[PDB]
């Protein structure tokens, strides 16, 4: 019984059956078609330098209400316009137009966080510093 062919010669049947049931794992097809180097906004990178176009009011999901103060950036290498979160308090006002910020992933591989809807990314630096340092006032920004 049990389904599988338990035969002492049945290994090609066994291995083909395994190889073709692997794709239903979310990650085997995701590497092996090549989907990061095809159509995720980054090319397998973790951070990308981008250019600020817009400041966006993304309003949070259902058990919350807040306007989240995100930013709408464009990549350098690839041209994608993409939302990005500007993290902790008051650091929207540290960013103006076209500020060449640095984008990271967000904590769940490439899905959203909590109650910003649809966003994948975040900013960590603006034009070559940081945001932690700027927020704790331990670094002052150069002026271009």
């Amino acid at each position: 019984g049990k389904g599988k062919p338990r035969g002492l010669n049945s290994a090609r049947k066994l291995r083909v059956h395994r190889r073709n049931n692997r794709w239903a794992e979310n990650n085997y097809k995701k590497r092996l078609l090549g989907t990061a180097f095809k159509s995720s906004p980054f090319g397998g990178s973790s951070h990308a330098k981008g250019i600020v176009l817009e400041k966006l009011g993304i309003e949070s999901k259902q058990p919350n209400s807040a306007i989240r103060k995100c930013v709408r950036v464009q990549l350098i290498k690839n041209g994608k316009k993409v939302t990005a979160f500007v993290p902790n308090d008051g650091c929207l006002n540290f960013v103006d137009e076209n500020d060449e910020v640095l984008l990271a992933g967000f904590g769940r591989k490439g899905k959203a966080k909590g109650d910003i809807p649809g966003v994948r990314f975040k900013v960590v630096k603006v034009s070559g510093v940081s945001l932690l340092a700027l927020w704790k006032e331990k670094k002052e920004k150069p002026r271009s």
Binding site: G7, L8, N9, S10, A11, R12, L14, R15
Partner: peptide, 13 residues
């Protein structure tokens, strides 16, 4: 001839 496979421990023709 028969070919072994280590993973499945089973031959394959």
């Amino acid at each position: 001839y028969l070919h072994y496979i280590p993973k499945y421990n089973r031959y394959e023709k």
